[PDB]
Amino acid sequence: EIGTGFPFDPHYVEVLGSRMHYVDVGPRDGTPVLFLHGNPTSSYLWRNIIPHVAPSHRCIAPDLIGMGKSDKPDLDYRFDDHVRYLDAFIEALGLEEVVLVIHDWGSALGFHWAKRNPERVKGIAFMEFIRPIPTWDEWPEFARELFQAFRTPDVGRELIIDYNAFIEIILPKFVVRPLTEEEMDHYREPFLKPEWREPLWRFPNELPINGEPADIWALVEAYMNWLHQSPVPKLLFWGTPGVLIPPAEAARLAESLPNLKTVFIGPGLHYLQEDNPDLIGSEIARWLPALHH
Ligand SMILES: [Cl-]
């Protein structure tokens, strides 16, 4: 049965005047494996994946600023805020070379950092990641009205801020198997009060859809161009029907990206880690040794 516990001792680092929480397990040296969650999750999303990798490699899984057990500074929580704080977290941990394991907005952060640090990135494992969405017709129909509403003035803030839609609707909607109450309560803990929910609303308002917002669209196109030209080792996990990465997109990536291994995880929507953590973790562990020449 999929584990609901979070058996990781807390670690904190002060950056830019705020504390960020992170998981840090495994050996203390070697190339670390940096796990980056997205919306509306935290390092809790990686709880059943990390134990597959920790016997062989250091595993570092930060909570993005304003999320998980990290501090809640008074920010807009725009994408560039998350870039700045994750850059400061990576710096404070002294990371030189890394393997990235990334999802959702954690993948936009990770691919943007990799583009800027191409000689530091030794591998990227990614799943249900951020890519330019050409129009609303390439957003899944069953979640279209909701995400259009999230991006509608006033309505979206009411849904996400006042009524906590990203936690109470989207999270269970985007896992195939049923979440348990214990798992929901872990996810709910950082957002029990509405003044804590700004990151949750800003993220869907940053999604690059039909050119907008233009700055994120440009940034995501840039790192996808980098990815298509980079020889870095790559590992993609995909499910069916998927959400950001449907099977047709997984196939396009299998054809286009260099040095790519793909793993089909079975039924999956967006939070693939909650549907098949053990295959994701075991396959990451099996893929890592070849990154060490
Ligand atoms: Cl989002």
Author numbering: 3 to 295
Question: What is written in the article reporting this PDB entry?
Answer:
The target protein used in this study is the computationally stabilized haloalkane dehalogenase DhaA115 designed previously using the web server FireProt. Eleven mutations that were originally introduced in the wild type increased its apparent melting temperature (Tmapp) to approx. 73 °C (ΔTmapp ∼ 23 °C), making it the most stable haloalkane dehalogenase to date. First, DhaA115 displays activity toward a broad range of halogenated substrates, many of which are toxic and carcinogenic compounds persistent in the environment, e.g., 1,2-dichloroethane and 1,2-dibromoethane. This makes the enzyme particularly valuable for biotechnological applications that detoxify and degrade harmful pollutants.
Following the experimental validation of all FireProt designs, we removed the destabilizing mutations L161M, I163L from DhaA216 and obtained the most stable FireProt variant, DhaA223, with 6 °C higher Tmapp compared to DhaA115. We obtained diffraction-quality crystals of DhaA223 and DhaA231 enzymes that belonged to the space groups P1211 and P212121 and diffracted at 1.5 and 1.3 Å resolution, respectively. The positioning of catalytic pentad residues was not disturbed, which is a prerequisite for efficient catalysis. Here, we show that the protein backbones of DhaA223 and DhaA231 superpose well with that of the DhaA115, although some minor changes are observed in the hinge regions between the helical cap domain and the hydrolase core. The crystal structures of DhaA223 and DhaA231 thus suggest that stabilization was achieved via strengthening intricate networks of residue-to-residue interactions, stabilizing the αβα-sandwich architecture. A notable example includes residues 184 and 197, where mutation of hydrophobic valines to glutamic acids created local hydrogen-bond networks involving water molecules. Specifically, this translates to approx. 7-, 12-, and 5-times longer half-lives at 70 °C of DhaA222, 223, and 231, respectively, compared to the 8-minute half-life of DhaA115 at this temperature. Consequently, DhaA222 and DhaA223 reach similar levels of catalytic efficiency at 60 °C when adjusted for the substrate inhibition (i.e., kcat·Ksi/Km), which is 3–4 times higher compared to DhaA115 and DhaA231. The substrate inhibition of DhaA222 and DhaA231 is exergonic at the whole temperature range, in contrast to DhaA223, for which it becomes energetically unfavorable at high temperatures.
